[PDB]
Design a protein around this ligand. Structure first.
Ligand SMILES: *[C@@H]1O[C@H](CO)[C@@H](O)[C@H](O)[C@H]1NC(C)=O
Ligand SMILES: *[C@@H]1O[C@H](CO)[C@@H](O)[C@H](O)[C@H]1NC(C)=O
Ligand SMILES: *[C@@H]1O[C@H](CO)[C@@H](O)[C@H](O)[C@H]1NC(C)=O
Ligand SMILES: *[C@@H]1O[C@H](CO)[C@@H](O)[C@H](O)[C@H]1NC(C)=O
Ligand SMILES: *[C@@H]1O[C@H](CO)[C@@H](O)[C@H](O)[C@H]1NC(C)=O
Lengths: 439, 52, 439
């Protein structure tokens, strides 16, 4: 026996549905949602870290001229300076008073610490979905866990469940993201091989264990000072350090709809969009025949208090007469009122008590207890506190919901004005007939 | 039949073959009027009738 | 200097482009495509294989009644029979001539060979692309390799190339595919947990090393024959074996556009759709000034042979007078004619020879050699062979391309008819003017 329902995507609020099969007693179910997760597909592009500069000892050749050759290492440079005259702690280095020369060189490498401090660039694609549910079944709690599409079925206590698909495809991620130790940012990084001297991406590599490195920093050598031996240079500072000081706020603090974000693996948790359909199959052994259930013959209703707040602020008292002891279900027949209890116990001649929640100013609703109906009515007062810490447990109201007193005044005014037009219309018709006939 | 775009044929466990068509005709594009029409008819059959 | 061009997606046909920069001599490049590859992103769902049935020894209990209990193994079954009287090789087994019973049981497991013979079900998403080229650059061949999107740049011999993106998103794979030992199929496999008794998907598992198995094969026990000890049963045969004998043709033999398919990893190669843009940056040291290049002052053209086949069926001879020894480029100024040679060497007072291919019945085109132009014209004949083994090397024709003799005939017929209308209209205008004045 198949049954289909639809529930909105909100966490922490229970819902109820009614199953009615001819020949058997009605049965009421309750469901509550505990988590929803989305997870995209990722591919890696490159990584970035700090860099290091390597400079060997200079070469001083006196009474001669030096020269240098080219090499293939990244950011290589060589220069030759004339007219030098170094000093040391013991005196002058070389005899000749002129025609001395100095040679200098340097190149750029990749730092060793890149295996612990690095950032990574990705591309994102379509995501999947998963969910977790709690169901009250046959007087006990059970849990189910499944994928949110039509391609999965689970069986708990001889019952099948199918969840999904979802009604919306909204995702908080763009095509390009960048990840760093628990934080995710949206960024449009420069392409591979097109870095800049002082921004994010001046040095690049394909994987932390690669040997190929691309670098686009500036390196210019300078003339040494008189009487000293050293190798000065000019170079733009690192770009990865600057980004750590100027990155700003991450997605966890800016994302819409109240989503949460975790990074191992990258996921989004508890985003409130749309609704989820559900399908359930119940075996024949779970029902009770109508001849065996007790019957109820006389009903009454009395309500002593009502305040239409966001919590359960009603109380009702119902009297009954029952044929024999057993169980029964309770269910509301209006959409504006919700009832907490699912089952009640009946015996002999007694009374039972229930509680409810509503947003209507004037209350009128019906209650079903084992194939019988009863009518209740009341007047409700407003609350006194302004702000709470939990969402409402009732539905919103429409334009047709109006207090009983207010409805009476509109009828009187509309009727009174309408009568004047009616009496005027009859007079005009009588006169017009006499003119037409007499001529 | 060999279309304009080509045909591919496979036989047993061997490698496939490929064929493409090439222009040929029995008319001539220089000469008397009735020989000119035959040239274009055998190359673009459907367009020659519509325009004429 | 930046240059942009567009190349059609065809393998095995060279193409040429012209670079023109004021103040310098022109340059010609040649490009040719060798391979294009597409590769999707995959995700695993479940795997299937063959099964095994387990039957332990029967229990024959004489002069009594037996019973059996329930268990959790897949496809478990029990039954108890009465009225048995088994035999062995030495005589009857037990004394009593009645009140004997027999018990039997069986269940289903996963066969050992699932680690070698299995099939896998996947889910597919968007694909990436890659390409490889050969370029003729200053008299030498160089090769480039890059991804077919705008986020990659490569540098070879001080020149930077950027390729992509593609003009079409067509792919030969659907959302669901199946892979088995080098063949790929398009199939709509059943949901997990919803198998069928005699088709693909009766046995399901999540990983070849996992312990959970789902089975939906029918199994019913039957009554033993008189005087024998054995355990008969009835069962639907395996669905994996049936699929192997009637699976049909693969994706390689049925795909359109001439694509080829490989499986480790899954790829598609050499599909002919769309076109690819290319961008190239040329440095300043590669150019030559106008004053250093030679100059050519007198020219003439002659065409001794033409035949408009799919190969190079033309030959031409050009005379020239040059100022000094050097090099020059050759380029065609029309779209319907292609010239094979890229550069020549000129000196003194001599002649040079070139070849071309075209689809026109009457050939007229212009040739440029180091900033000067010449005019050629000839008549062409049709070939004799019907079918060849290679594609064409020239472009298709339009409506404006018509032989010179045919164009002459249209002008006489059209012009003559127009005269009859023109002379007739003048008569009407004059005769109308006289009547207007006469009144
Ligand atoms: C821990 O250090 C290893 C390298 O030693 C690094 O791969 C890993 O990312 C680090 N994890 C954290 C949380 O810092
Ligand atoms: C578990 O079931 C009991 C009734 O047996 C119910 O009172 C309780 O609320 C259920 N658990 C939760 C978390 O609601
Ligand atoms: C042209 O004439 C030849 C004469 O043998 C004939 O075989 C052929 O079918 C004709 N048509 C074409 C298109 O060649
Ligand atoms: C070879 O056997 C191993 C298991 O022993 C299996 O994983 C593999 O797929 C086999 N190779 C082929 C080509 O089937
Ligand atoms: C390499 O360049 C030569 C010209 O020097 C050319 O003839 C040849 O075709 C090129 N190689 C390939 C594989 O095309």
């Amino acid at each position: 026996y198949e049954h289909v329902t639809v529930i909105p995507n909100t966490v922490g609020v229970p819902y109820k549905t009614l199953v009615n099969r001819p020949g058997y007693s009605p049965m009421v179910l309750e469901m509550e949602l505990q988590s929803v997760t989305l997870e995209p597909t990722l591919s890696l592009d490159y990584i970035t870290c700090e860099y290091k500069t390597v400079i060997p000892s200079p070469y001083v050749k006196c009474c001669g001229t030096a020269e240098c050759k080219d090499k293939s290492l990244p950011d290589y440079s060589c220069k030759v300076f004339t007219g030098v005259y170094p000093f040391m702690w013991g005196g002058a280095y070389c005899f000749c008073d002129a025609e001395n020369t100095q040679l200098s060189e340097a190149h750029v490498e990749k730092s060793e610490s890149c295996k612990t401090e690095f950032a990574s660039a990705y591309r994102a694609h379509t995501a999947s979905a998963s969910a977790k549910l709690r169901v009250l079944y046959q007087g006990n709690n059970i849990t189910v866990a499944a994928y949110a599409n039509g391609d999965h079925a689970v069986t708990v206590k001889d019952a099948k469940f199918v969840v999904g698909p979802m009604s919306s495809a909204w995702t908080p991620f763009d095509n390009k993201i960048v990840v760093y130790k628990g934080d995710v940012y949206n960024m449009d990084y420069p392409p591979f091989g097109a870095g800049r001297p002082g921004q994010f991406g001046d040095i690049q590599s394909r994987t932390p264990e690669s040997k190929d490195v691309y670098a686009n920093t500036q390196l210019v050598l300078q003339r040494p000072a008189a009487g000293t031996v050293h190798v000065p240079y000019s170079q733009a500072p690192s770009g990865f350090k600057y980004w750590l000081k100027e990155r700003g706020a991450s997605l966890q603090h800016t994302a819409p709809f109240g989503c949460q974000i975790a990074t191992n693996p990258v996921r989004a948790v508890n985003c409130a969009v749309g609704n989820i359909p559900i399908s359930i199959d119940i075996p024949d052994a779970a029902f009770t025949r109508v001849v065996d259930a007790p019957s109820v013959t006389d009903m009454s209703c009395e309500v002593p208090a009502c305040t239409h707040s966001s919590d359960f602020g009603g109380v009702a008292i119902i009297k009954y007469t029952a044929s024999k002891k057993g169980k029964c279900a309770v269910h509301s027949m209006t959409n504006a009122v919700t009832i907490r209890e699912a089952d009640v116990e009946v015996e002999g001649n007694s009374q039972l008590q229930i509680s409810f929640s509503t947003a209507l100013a004037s209350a009128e609703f019906r209650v079903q207890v084992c194939s019988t109906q009863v009518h209740c009515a009341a007047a409700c007062h407003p609350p006194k506190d302004h702000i709470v810490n939990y969402p409402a447990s009732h539905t919103t109201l429409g334009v047709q919901d109006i207090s009983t007193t207010a409805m009476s005044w509109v009828q009187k005014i509309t009727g009174g004005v309408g009568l004047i037009v009616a009496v005027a219309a009859l007079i005009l018709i009588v006169v017009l007939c006499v003119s037409f006939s007499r001529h | 039949t060999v279309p304009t775009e080509g045909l591919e044929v496979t036989w047993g466990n061997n490698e496939p073959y490929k064929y493409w068509p090439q222009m040929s005709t029995n008319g001539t594009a220089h000469g008397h009027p009735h020989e000119i029409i035959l040239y274009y008819y055998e190359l673009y059959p459907t367009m020659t009738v519509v325009i004429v």
